[PDB]
Curated annotation (Swiss-Prot), chains A, B:
Impact noted for substituting V60L: In EYFP; leads to yellow fluorescence, folds faster and more efficiently at 37 degrees Celsius and has superior solubility and brightness
Post-translational modification (record): Contains a chromophore consisting of modified amino acid residues. Maturation of the chromophore requires nothing other than molecular oxygen.
Organism: Aequorea victoria
Consequence when changing I120V: In EBFP2.0; shifts the excitation and emission spectra to shorter wavelengths and increases quantum yields compared to BFP
Role according to the record: Energy-transfer acceptor. Its role is to transduce the blue chemiluminescence of the protein aequorin into green fluorescent light by energy transfer. Fluoresces in vivo upon receiving energy from the Ca(2+)-activated photoprotein aequorin.
Effect of I159V: In P9; increases fluorescence at 475 nm excitation. In R10-3; matures to the red-emitting state with excitation and emission maxima at 555 and 585 nm, respectively
The protein's name in its UniProt record: Green fluorescent protein
Impact reported for T195Y: Gives rise to yellow-emission variants. In EYFP; leads to yellow fluorescence, folds faster and more efficiently at 37 degrees Celsius and has superior solubility and brightness
Impact after mutating N138I: In ECFP; leads to cyan fluorescence, folds faster and more efficiently at 37 degrees Celsius and has superior solubility and brightness
This protein's UniProt keywords: Chromophore, Luminescence, Photoprotein
Assembly: Monomer.
Amino acid sequence: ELFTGVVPILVELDGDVNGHKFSVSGEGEGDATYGKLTLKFICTTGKLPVPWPTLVTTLVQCFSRYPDHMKRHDFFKSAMPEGYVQERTIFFKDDGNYKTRAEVKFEGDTLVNRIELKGIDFKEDGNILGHKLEYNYNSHNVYIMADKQKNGIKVNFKIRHNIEDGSVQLADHYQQNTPIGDGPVLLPDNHYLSTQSALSKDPNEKRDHMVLLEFVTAAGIT
Amino acid sequence: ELFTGVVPILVELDGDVNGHKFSVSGEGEGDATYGKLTLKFICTTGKLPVPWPTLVTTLVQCFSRYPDHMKRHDFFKSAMPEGYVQERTIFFKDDGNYKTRAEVKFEGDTLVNRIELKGIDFKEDGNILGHKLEYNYNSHNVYIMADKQKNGIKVNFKIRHNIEDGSVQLADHYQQNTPIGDGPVLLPDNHYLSTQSALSKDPNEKRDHMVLLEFVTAAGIT
């Protein structure tokens, strides 16, 4: 019943990529019934030092639509409201890597995603710091498996970012989610989330920002 | 001033792929100010014989957001309200092809897209008739150039459809748009539309349908 209607979402990120510090604030709404998300982010420290598309996966999988027959595999919602911790190591092929740690939980009636990100070893002339990424996103499947020892799940997937010249920059994701609370949680059978994302800009917004629409549905179990 | 706010959209398609006839009805709204589209389609003849993603490009580029400095290259809107004719030959790599003809124009206050589609040479066991396509969409650039002789434009692009096994089915698009009215129109310099699309399902809808969200912005001119 926490995810029954539209839920307000607040996101906050503090990062450092190669010595450059920035912060991002975001606000939106989620509807797990449709598996839809609408979020708007603003770089609150000026201009974002890395391309916006690279932060999409870091900037709330509890909003996925789990079909009724897959209800018992919803680790994300089952960990609420105490929330869970999401950690990732994102490896950019032939470039650097982001290490992130986030706590996602309810604070009042709002679902909050608080993140700290550290990126290192990025090439000054690569696609990321060189800003050679198109402002768009492709569709990917997010694989999930239970990590029983940790009372959580382990997730893995690969994102393909389109580069301006027509090629593609791969970003390998290694994710780990563990609950914040001390009680039992729902450990899933292997399945994946079919995720799709669309980026745009609010034509009236003067600040550096990204408008994100995302649809996510679980699949893989019959 | 036709595209000043949210405009209602009505789409209608009659098709035949390899001898199988079907019809699709769709309704939605467009906002050229944001370059956003929300459409909902229903197969009115039962189950769609081909995968929904293959019909996305066929099922209204006048809704693209043209930045102010690119205003004079908007062939699409400049052809309204008399509308224009859009014709395509879509070649599915190692498979068959769709040939489509559509008239897009205003009928009252609604923007109508009426299409006839014919597909042939499809392989019974290929990705299309075999339905091996994931229900999702990637981001692509739609290239545009003027066809002065025809008082229209010529468009070309390639769509990459994700196949369930992890590979990709390419679909080559060759497009031609000519005005329906007899007056002057705006012929653009070469530019492209950055197009992004997201597909979902209305969990309450019993009929075979596709919910489509699409964002389009013109770029390529400085």
